[PDB]
Write an enzyme that holds these catalytic residues in place. Structure first.
Site, short mmCIF file in Angstrom:
data_model
loop_
_atom_site.label_atom_id
_atom_site.label_comp_id
_atom_site.label_asym_id
_atom_site.label_seq_id
_atom_site.Cartn_x
_atom_site.Cartn_y
_atom_site.Cartn_z
CG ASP A 110 -86.20 100.69 4.77
OD1 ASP A 110 -85.80 99.92 3.86
OD2 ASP A 110 -85.37 101.16 5.57
CG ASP A 129 -85.37 97.25 7.21
OD1 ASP A 129 -84.69 98.28 7.42
OD2 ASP A 129 -84.86 96.13 7.49
CG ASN A 159 -81.05 96.72 9.13
OD1 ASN A 159 -81.82 97.26 8.32
ND2 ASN A 159 -80.62 97.34 10.21
CG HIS A 160 -85.33 96.74 11.33
ND1 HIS A 160 -85.69 97.20 12.58
CD2 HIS A 160 -84.42 97.63 10.86
CE1 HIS A 160 -85.03 98.31 12.85
NE2 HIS A 160 -84.26 98.60 11.82
CG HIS A 180 -89.15 100.49 9.23
ND1 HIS A 180 -88.52 99.45 9.89
CD2 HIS A 180 -88.16 101.18 8.60
CE1 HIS A 180 -87.22 99.50 9.65
NE2 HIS A 180 -86.98 100.54 8.87
NE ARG A 239 -77.01 102.35 8.67
CZ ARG A 239 -78.33 102.41 8.64
NH1 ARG A 239 -79.05 101.81 9.58
NH2 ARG A 239 -78.94 103.06 7.66
CG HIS A 294 -82.28 96.36 3.59
ND1 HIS A 294 -83.50 96.99 3.46
CD2 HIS A 294 -81.77 96.76 4.78
CE1 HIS A 294 -83.72 97.74 4.52
NE2 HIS A 294 -82.68 97.62 5.34
CG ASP A 344 -88.44 96.05 14.34
OD1 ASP A 344 -89.25 95.51 15.13
OD2 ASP A 344 -87.29 95.58 14.20
NE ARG A 345 -86.65 102.24 14.82
CZ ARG A 345 -85.54 102.46 14.12
NH1 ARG A 345 -85.42 102.00 12.86
NH2 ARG A 345 -84.56 103.16 14.67
CG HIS A 397 -79.86 100.15 5.36
ND1 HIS A 397 -80.41 99.64 6.52
CD2 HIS A 397 -78.53 100.25 5.59
CE1 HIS A 397 -79.45 99.44 7.41
NE2 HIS A 397 -78.30 99.80 6.87
#
Lengths: 59, 295
Positions: B59, B87, B119-120, B61, B216, B168, B90-91, B243
């Site tokens: 990741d 990923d 997943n993002h 991000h 989750r 992922h 995001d974040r 992940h």
């Protein structure tokens, strides 16, 4: 020269080294809790979809 | 007509700078990147069969400055071959720079540079966790819609020299044959349950026997014996996934048969973890290059 096509895997033991407690056990528990709290994306899937829905309906 | 050498050059211009300096590409360039990469993804298999050597990253991000640190350490393309596990958005503060550089390199080195779907890379998470807001602040909603269509076409897993399985998230209770991955049609959204969901959402868990509930609230956890059986059955040596932030950038599971890679150090200003990238040489010997946390 490409690597897309369409032997045994080992660990570099010297690299691994080069990279229990009541304090360390506490530190691990805090991290696990932080991580559990942070990963909340599952909670907002429905809302995200409803937001995608109504912004589509603007047209 | 879209100038890839120019785009890479401008994105790389901030290399020495104080973290957080923006690169402003033109709208039409960004969607040029999306449209061309989308084409390349669709033209290559959904389950990549790859040869060593290569660097594998977890990741990122939106942590653009940290992505540049990774290339500095591992060698900028095409000095090295890359597989990223997803990923990218995001974040973080700089999702656009991150994805654009990655998409640019995909277009320039389509057979030495690889991106899997996280997943993002999915509208149901994107809307809410930074990317959409980034798009709307610096450009417009329409651009976010364009990225969505590109992400919907990303490949899902990779096998490295028939020995290392990469995705992922992790395994699926529904994964019996590699052909099941090959059958997924694109473009596609991530479903709420099933194989494609699990591959992007599941987690290893020390305390679980077989398949368990995931905190989750999506997908599952799997235990160590599950990993053992999978490698045995499909004649593999290692599962490589991302992940979950881990403190040392990487972490082993199930007597070294699975590894979690996470490449963003100081993750989103909320953790003080290291980031790691994994080096796989021609004989499949694996080593780890760490980005240490700020001091």
């Amino acid at each position: 020269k490409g690597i897309l096509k369409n032997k045994s895997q080992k660990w570099d033991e010297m690299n691994i080294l080069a990279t229990l407690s009541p304090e360390e056990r506490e530190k691990k528990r805090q991290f696990e809790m932080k991580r559990k709290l942070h990963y909340n994306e599952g909670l907002n899937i429905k809302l995200a979809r409803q937001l995608i829905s109504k912004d589509l309906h603007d047209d | 007509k879209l100038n890839i050498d120019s785009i890479i050059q401008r994105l790389l211009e901030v290399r020495g700078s104080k973290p957080g300096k923006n690169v402003q590409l033109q709208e039409n360039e960004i969607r040029g990147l999306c449209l061309k990469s989308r084409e390349i993804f669709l033209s290559q298999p959904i389950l990549l069969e790859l040869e060593a050597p290569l660097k594998i990253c977890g990741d990122i991000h939106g942590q653009y400055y940290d992505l540049l640190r990774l290339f500095e350490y591992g060698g900028f393309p095409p000095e090295s071959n890359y597989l990223f596990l997803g990923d990218y958005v995001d974040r973080g503060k700089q999702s656009l720079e991150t994805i654009c550089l990655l998409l640019a390199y995909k277009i320039k080195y389509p057979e030495n540079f690889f991106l899997l779907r996280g997943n993002h890379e999915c509208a149901s998470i994107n809307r809410i966790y930074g990317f959409y807001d980034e798009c709307k602040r610096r450009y417009n909603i329409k651009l976010w819609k364009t990225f969505t269509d590109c992400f919907n076409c990303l490949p899902i897993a990779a096998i490295v020299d028939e020995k290392i399985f990469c995705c992922h998230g992790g395994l699926s209770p529904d994964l019996q044959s590699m052909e099941q991955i090959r059958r997924i049609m694109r473009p596609t959204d991530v479903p709420d349950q099933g194989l494609l969901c699990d591959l992007l959402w599941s987690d290893p868990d020390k305390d679980v026997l077989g398949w368990g509930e995931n905190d989750r609230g999506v997908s599952f956890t799997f235990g160590a014996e599950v990993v053992a059986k999978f490698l045995h059955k499909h004649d593999l040596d290692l599962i490589c996934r991302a992940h979950q932030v881990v403190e040392d950038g990487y972490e082993f599971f199930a007597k070294r048969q699975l590894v979690t890679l996470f490449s963003a150090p100081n993750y989103c200003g909320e953790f003080d973890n290291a980031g790691a990238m994994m080096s796989v040489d021609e004989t499949l010997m694996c080593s780890f290059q760490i980005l240490k946390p700020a001091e």
